[PDB]
């Protein structure tokens, strides 16, 4: 690059946008994530590095609630990730105010992806340094899960992972047999996969933030009860 990798408005000689090619590197460097579409819902999971024990119980959590039934598991530059989560919350609120009911996940993912692409198109603004999964469930549309790269577009995922170790997580994700496994065992298995991914081999101790959406929660994307999912973390440990 050298000369062409200064602003996103400058195309590469081969026809590439090196600003986003570098923004993807921040996502590749930040801690990983995972989201699996269970048979009747979607289960999230993210390891968060407790950089210092001075911090309280899990804060700046990689999980977010963008709408009543929709959750966002994000990785990458966390401040811009939170700003984008606020953008998604505003988009969901606006859609609910205008068209009523709840925003379908495919349309929400498409709109937030178009907003992210608007931020990577220009020169004055810079591409977002974050990649996130949007997971939701409803009785009508089942469970959906869309993943958005820092510059790419939403894609339907049965199971997806992002962050430091995408391939290592995805191998065991594809090893796992989804589409017939209930969200409970999927919660056990996502923690198992995260613990299989390196946590303290080169880093500090990690916390297990896991999220729910499904008919077992009648929609209503909420963080899994951590007190009762500590045993799921224990099964992951074994």
């Amino acid at each position: 690059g050298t000369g062409y990798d200064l602003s996103a408005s400058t195309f590469s000689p081969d026809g590439r946008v090196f600003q986003v090619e570098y923004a993807m590197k921040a996502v590749e460097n930040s801690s990983t994530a995972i989201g699996i579409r269970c048979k009747d819902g979607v289960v999230f999971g993210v390891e968060k590095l407790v950089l210092s024990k001075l911090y309280e119980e899990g804060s700046n959590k990689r999980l977010f609630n963008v709408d009543r039934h929709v959750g966002m598991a994000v990785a990458g530059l966390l401040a811009d990730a939170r700003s984008l989560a606020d953008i998604a919350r505003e988009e969901a609120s606006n859609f609910r105010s205008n068209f009523g009911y709840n925003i379908p996940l495919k349309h929400l993912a498409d709109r937030v992806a178009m907003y992210v692409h608007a931020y990577t198109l220009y020169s004055a603004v810079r591409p977002f340094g974050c990649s996130f999964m949007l997971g939701s469930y409803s009785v009508n549309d089942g469970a959906q899960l869309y993943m958005i790269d820092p510059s790419g577009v939403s894609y339907g995922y049965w199971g997806c992972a992002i962050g430091k170790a995408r391939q290592a997580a995805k191998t065991e994700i594809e090893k796992l047999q989804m589409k017939e496994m209930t969200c409970r065992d999927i919660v056990k298995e996502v923690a198992k996969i995260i613990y299989i991914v390196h946590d303290e081999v080169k880093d500090k101790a990690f916390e297990l933030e896991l999220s729910w959406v499904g008919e077992l929660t009648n929609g209503r994307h909420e963080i899994v009860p951590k007190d009762i999912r500590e045993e799921a973390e224990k099964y992951a440990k074994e």
Partner: peptide, 15 residues
């Protein structure tokens, strides 16, 4: 068109 699905009557009434 942007949903690739027929709209709801409730959605039309909201509009």
């Amino acid at each position: 068109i942007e949903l690739n699905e027929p709209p709801l009557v409730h959605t039309a009434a909201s509009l």
